[PDB]
């Protein structure tokens, strides 16, 4: 049948990101695979238009929620959306800096998931650490998942980036995942997805290449009285 049964195989993915920042256009293409049982996977991304005009760091979350590792007591909404598919409407607001707004669609073709993302990054500080490429690491974080009506789940996160000058650049992440289909789908109750990410420069062309690894797994926390 559908949902998690479609993810019971090694999978591949391809992502096409159509973006702009402060009016400068860019294109990123990324691909990779995720081996069953998922939860730990790599992606290789390339800026097709040459040099990325901003830090690659804030792009980390654009470069597959359905590859997170879930325990059986929590419905894995992102996988349950297949085969009809998944759309995401996401905004990351960077403190003292710009806002990135992304619209994602995800389609499954046999064992390859194709992603299309359009992203607008508005109001980024030309002399800030994103535009000057001064972000170094991405902090592991405990994203919060909430039910959001009949066919959607909301993921809220605090994503901190360490910077060359020691202060954190904090992103406020707010992401609505919506099922493309019309059957009833199980909506998980409140829970958490732990996300650990690392991005590394790859040998660079006339184009920026980056390799990225992500570890992602869900858990819950029981209520009182206990």
Task: Kindly give, in sequence order, each residue whose CB lies less than 8 Å from that of residue 167, ignoring residues fewer than 6 positions away.
Answer: none
Which of 82-90, 146-154, 180-188, 198-206 is the region at the interface with Na ion (rule: CB under 5 A)?
A: 82-90
Nearer to Cl ion, 152 or 216 (CB): 216
Nearer to its own copies, 50 or 140 (CB): 140
48 touches which of Na ion, Cl ion, its own copies, none (CB within 5 to 8 A by kind)?
Answer: none
Residue 1 C-beta: closest distance to its own copies, Å:
30
Site for its own copies in 92-111 (CB under 8 A): none
Which of 50-58, 124-132, 154-162, 177-185 is the region at the interface with its own copies (rule: CB under 8 A)?
A: 154-162
Task: Report whether 162 contacts 171 (CB < 8 A).
Answer: no
200 binds Cl ion (CB under 5 A): yes
- Element (H or E) spanning 77, and its range? helix 77-80
Give the position of tokens 């420069």.
201
Residue 79 DSSP code: H
Residue 188 C-beta: closest distance to its own copies, Å:
13
Beta bridge partners of 218: 193
- 15 half-sphere exposure, CB direction, 13 A CA radius: 24
Percent of the chain as helix, strand, coil, to the nearest 5: 5, 55, 40
Which of 83-91, 97-105, 111-119, 141-149 is the region at the interface with its own copies (rule: CB under 8 A)?
A: 141-149
Nearer to Na ion, 20 or 133 (CB): 20
Number of residues that bind its own copies (CB under 8 A): 33
Distance, CA of 209 to CA of 87 (rounded, Å):
26
């Amino acid at each position: 049948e559908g949902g998690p049964a479609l993810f019971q195989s090694d999978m591949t993915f391809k992502i096409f990101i159509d973006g702009e920042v402060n009016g400068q256009k860019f294109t990123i293409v990324a691909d990779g695979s995720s081996k069953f049982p998922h939860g730990d996977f790599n992606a290789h991304a390339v800026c097709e238009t040459g040099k990325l005009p901003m830090s690659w760091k804030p792009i980390c979350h654009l470069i597959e929620p359905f590859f997170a590792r879930y325990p059986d007591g929590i419905s894995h909404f992102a996988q349950e959306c297949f085969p009809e598919g998944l759309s995401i409407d996401r905004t990351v607001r960077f403190e003292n800096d710009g806002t990135m707004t992304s619209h994602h669609t995800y389609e499954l073709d046999d064992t390859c998931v194709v992603s299309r993302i359009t992203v607008n990054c508005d109001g980024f500080q030309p002399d800030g650490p994103i535009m000057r490429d001064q972000l170094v690491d991405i902090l592991p974080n405990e994203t919060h998942m909430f039910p959001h009506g009949p066919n959607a789940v909301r993921q809220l996160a605090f994503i901190g980036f360490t910077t060359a000058d020691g202060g954190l650049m904090m992103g406020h992440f707010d992401s609505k995942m919506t099922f493309n289909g019309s059957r009833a789908i199980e909506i998980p109750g409140p829970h958490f997805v732990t996300i650990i990410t690392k991005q590394m420069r790859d040998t660079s062309d006339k184009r920026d290449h980056v390799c990225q690894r992500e570890v992602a797994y869900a858990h819950s926390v029981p209520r009182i009285t206990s």
